[PDB]
Amino acid sequence: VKSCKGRCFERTFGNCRCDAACVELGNCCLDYQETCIEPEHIWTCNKFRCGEKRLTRSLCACSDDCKDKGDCCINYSSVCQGEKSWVEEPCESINEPQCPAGFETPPTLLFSLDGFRAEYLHTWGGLLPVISKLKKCGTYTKNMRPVYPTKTFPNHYSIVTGLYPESHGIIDNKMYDPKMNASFSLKSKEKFNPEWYKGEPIWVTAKYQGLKSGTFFWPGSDVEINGIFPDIYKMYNGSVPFEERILAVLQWLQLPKDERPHFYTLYLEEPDSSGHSYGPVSSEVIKALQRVDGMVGMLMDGLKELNLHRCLNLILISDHGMEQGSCKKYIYLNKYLGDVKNIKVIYGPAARLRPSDVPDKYYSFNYEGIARNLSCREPNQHFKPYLKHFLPKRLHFAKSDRIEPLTFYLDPQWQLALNPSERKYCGSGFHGSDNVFSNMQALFVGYGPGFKHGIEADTFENIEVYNLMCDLLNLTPAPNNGTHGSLNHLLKNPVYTPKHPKEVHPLVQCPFTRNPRDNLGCSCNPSILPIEDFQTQFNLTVAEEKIIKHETLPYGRPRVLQKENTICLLSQHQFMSGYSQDILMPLWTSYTVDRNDSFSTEDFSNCLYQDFRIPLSPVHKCSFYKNNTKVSYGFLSPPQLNKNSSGIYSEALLTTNIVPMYQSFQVIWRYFHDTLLRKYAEERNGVNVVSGPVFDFDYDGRCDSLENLRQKRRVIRNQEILIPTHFFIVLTSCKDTSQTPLHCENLDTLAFILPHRTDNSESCVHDSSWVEELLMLHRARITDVEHITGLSFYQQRKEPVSDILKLKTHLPTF
Ligand SMILES: *[C@@H]1O[C@H](CO)[C@@H](O[C@@H]2O[C@H](CO)[C@@H](O[C@@H]3O[C@H](CO)[C@@H](O)[C@H](O)[C@@H]3O)[C@H](O)[C@H]2NC(C)=O)[C@H](O)[C@H]1NC(C)=O
Ligand SMILES: *[C@@H]1O[C@H](CO)[C@@H](O[C@@H]2O[C@H](CO)[C@@H](O[C@H]3O[C@H](CO)[C@@H](O)[C@H](O)[C@@H]3O)[C@H](O)[C@H]2NC(C)=O)[C@H](O)[C@H]1NC(C)=O
Ligand SMILES: *[C@@H]1O[C@H](CO)[C@@H](O)[C@H](O)[C@H]1NC(C)=O
Ligand SMILES: *[C@@H]1O[C@H](CO)[C@@H](O)[C@H](O)[C@H]1NC(C)=O
Ligand SMILES: *[C@@H]1O[C@H](CO)[C@@H](O)[C@H](O)[C@H]1NC(C)=O
Numbered sequence: 127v128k129s130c131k132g133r134c135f136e137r138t139f140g141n142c143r144c145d146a147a148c149v150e151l152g153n154c155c156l157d158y159q160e161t162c163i164e165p166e167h168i169w170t171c172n173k174f175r176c177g178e179k180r181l182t183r184s185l186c187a188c189s190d191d192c193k194d195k196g197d198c199c200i201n202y203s204s205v206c207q208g209e210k211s212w213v214e215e216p217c218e219s220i221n222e223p224q225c226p227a228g229f230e231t232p233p234t235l236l237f238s239l240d241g242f243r244a245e246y247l248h249t250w251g252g253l254l255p256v257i258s259k260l261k262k263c264g265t266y267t268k269n270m271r272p273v274y275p276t277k278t279f280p281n282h283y284s285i286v287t288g289l290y291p292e293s294h295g296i297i298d299n300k301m302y303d304p305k306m307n308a309s310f311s312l313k314s315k316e317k318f319n320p321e322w323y324k325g326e327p328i329w330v331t332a333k334y335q336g337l338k339s340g341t342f343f344w345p346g347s348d349v350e351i352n353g354i355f356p357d358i359y360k361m362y363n364g365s366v367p368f369e370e371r372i373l374a375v376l377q378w379l380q381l382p383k384d385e386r387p388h389f390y391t392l393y394l395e396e397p398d399s400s401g402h403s404y405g406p407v408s409s410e411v412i413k414a415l416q417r418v419d420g421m422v423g424m425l426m427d428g429l430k431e432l433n434l435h436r437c438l439n440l441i442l443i444s445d446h447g448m449e450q451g452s453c454k455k456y457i458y459l460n461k462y463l464g465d466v467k468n469i470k471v472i473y474g475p476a477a478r479l480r481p482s483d484v485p486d487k488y489y490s491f492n493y494e495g496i497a498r499n500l501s502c503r504e505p506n507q508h509f510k511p512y513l514k515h516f517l518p519k520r521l522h523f524a525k526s527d528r529i530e531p532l533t534f535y536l537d538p539q540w541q542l543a544l545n546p547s548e549r550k551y552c553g554s555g556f557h558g559s560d561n562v563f564s565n566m567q568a569l570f571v572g573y574g575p576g577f578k579h580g581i582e583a584d585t586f587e588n589i590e591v592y593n594l595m596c597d598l599l600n601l602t603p604a605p606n607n608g609t610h611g612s613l614n615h616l617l618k619n620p621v622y623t624p625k626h627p628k629e630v631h632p633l634v635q636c637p638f639t640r641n642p643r644d645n646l647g648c649s650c651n652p653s654i655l656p657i658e659d660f661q662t663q664f665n666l667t668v669a670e671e672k673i674i675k676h677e678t679l680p681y682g683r684p685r686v687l688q689k690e691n692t693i694c695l696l697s698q699h700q701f702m703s704g705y706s707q708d709i710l711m712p713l714w715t716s717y718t719v720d721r722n723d724s725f726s727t728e729d730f731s732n733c734l735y736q737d738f739r740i741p742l743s744p745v746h747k748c749s750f751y752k753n754n755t756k757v758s759y760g761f762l763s764p765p766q767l768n769k770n771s772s773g774i775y776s777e778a779l780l781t782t783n784i785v786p787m788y789q790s791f792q793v794i795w796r797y798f799h800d801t802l803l804r805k806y807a808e809e810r811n812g813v814n815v816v817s818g819p820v821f822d823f824d825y826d827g828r829c830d831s832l833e834n835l836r837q838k839r840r841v842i843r844n845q846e847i848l849i850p851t852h853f854f855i856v857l858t859s860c861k862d863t864s865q866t867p868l869h870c871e872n873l874d875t876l877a878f879i880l881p882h883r884t885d886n887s888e889s890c891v892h893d894s895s896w897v898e899e900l901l902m903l904h905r906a907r908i909t910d911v912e913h914i915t916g917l918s919f920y921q922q923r924k925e926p927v928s929d930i931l932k933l934k935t936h937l938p939t940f
Pocket of ligand 1: 289290293294324325522605606607826827828913
């Protein structure tokens, strides 16, 4: 016979050898390698191995006795008995789980493919049959938004805590904490120091509530967090073959019920490693993608053999995407600063700057000096210096002391360093950029009894996944930055029903009080028809008010969730508002721009009308602002918008509809209300607008207390004034343009948190087309606005709460 089957390593008579010497003599049987050697180095059966005489040094068996001795290769039944593999079976729905005793609550496995950009599945899906089937049979989104910076430790730790890096403390793999005077490195023993890891990873949450955990690698799983390790964890060793990681998890799923985990993790270094080395569009990445596709297949086949393929909930995920770097698209700061030796620059697309003399000069150092030094130096400059607190609030990258006070925002494909010596190869693949860039977006597929089948969900953020995993494991989540219930649409049977938050103190009233018509110091433009009988013009019939309320608060009035705060509803013909006596300012106005409404070019500067519903105050007078070089004022509900006349809406000039405003910000505000709002109103057939001030002096993304606000007032012309840190805008139309904002089945929303700064250095003015770009950069989720104002919107919409949460957590795209 001319085959080695049955005779591996036996000396033979029959002119065809099966011993190691044959190779040198070139007289091996044609199947010698496949039959006798390959089995020492592979985890697969194949037509050469089916019914093999058992070899002692094989990793797994394809011998006839393999099912009895329980060590068949995972693909044994597919290849050697002609059964179908998991990927070959058509989708079938999992309406009831089929689990062994112990899994009354089914297990969840969090499977991470490092650096798997969402685009890889968009484009190479036809080369990835297993992940493609998981998508087809499961719950998929085209894009999961990672956290900023779009790096590995921060995103993995974010996924298992539901926290932004600014709150969980792992902002990068290399950090300096000044209050600890220590440095974090993965090569150091500081990696194991629990001082670094804030929040509560899901394996900790689980342990407190009775469930055990098995992590085969994950950031934090090798650290004693709140005094807890996972019940099973592995010391990181990237050289462990992917197959052995998957086989280990399959061994864990066969432990007896008393010691068998409910929560599992699996981490693979591909395709991040190949992406860095060869670029995201490369033969090496295609091969890496096909390899990880096969490892997912190996898991699914393994689960089928254990009859757990209709039991386990699989979350297939990645931390971040991958971009093509270029030596032509790297910025070196030494060009503008020279070979200075006193600063450390964290290089890459998420570049940060710090003094070398730490912790001594960390707070005293002249950040603003370098910030101004590096601003608007070139035309079409590809980087932008920001003091952390001036970065867009959507990035939630400021609160932590481990975030260097000076950061850089870089354009897509662009990185930054001090000089070419202090960086790795410029032409490599890279990640770290803004978390809304296409190529940074991440993988998400959910498959199992808990998840819906054949569903394509809209973009959601990875900070939402912790709550989802808690629901899948019947866990009460630790407090986190996800909006519990926003991902209920992914689940067959949601376990948490969200409720709209309750107003703590009921709305105070601001009654009309007869008082003297005073001089406010105004040189009003003649065209404006004043309010000559206030009490006449503002004594409204219930019918008249119902009409006004229906037109201006179609979604309900914003509700205040702040504890010690007293607001009152002020009514007008074209807008409503919530006024704060404590801060002498409205917290919010609400109005509606209709398609065919008039915007006036008529000047309305130095013109205010007194509101008799509140006490007159110095800071409500035109005179307080007349030739004032510290602060000016602006209107929330815009006087340029008339429904009745073609002139100026006089009621909009009330003292109660003004906010402190820097003259530089007036350009942005004036351009928005004169030009943009008109274009938006036409494009969307009407726009409901809610605008207001924001006080975030703590730069923690949260509305500050009344108590803390008292101490942040500035003294200008011997008066106490509170100057907003930001202004928020929330635009609301219908998805269907045919209908107007008052009659929408489905809301289309767009929100901004615009920074309130004394100059427009951020936009490098040198055509106001830059105002559009600044609005886009400072876009926010309605949830972001809610958190930073203490307000809660759309509480009167007839939609279920979970659907409203989905809408509020949405970030807009352009
Ligand atoms: C993201 O979610 C986390 C947790 O839900 C939020 O972080 C937490 O922020 C609160 C308020 O700043 C912190 O509480 C406080 O502790 C200090 C120090 O003892 C105390 O003086 C205060 O009175 C208050 O009780 C809490 O420590 C903190 N937790 C963590 C893990 O950082 C964060 O606010 C959320 N971020 C956003 C933007 O919603
Ligand atoms: C990290 O994981 C590595 C890959 O899984 C692993 O490397 C391997 O270690 C085995 C034994 O632990 C080596 O095998 C040699 O030792 C056996 C045992 O007696 C001897 O019979 C043989 O001489 C055999 O050569 C493998 O050579 C080695 N595999 C690879 C690919 O390197 C390490 O143990 C793990 N730990 C660290 C931190 O590196
Ligand atoms: C801080 O660490 C530095 C070295 O990193 C050390 O020389 C110094 O003694 C430490 N303590 C302080 C508070 O400066
Ligand atoms: C910025 O400061 C550096 C020193 O770090 C200096 O070389 C350069 O002249 C300054 N650039 C200016 C004033 O824009
Ligand atoms: C005050 O008036 C002076 C004189 O024209 C002018 O230079 C200055 O800009 C004015 N300041 C403000 C902010 O109105």
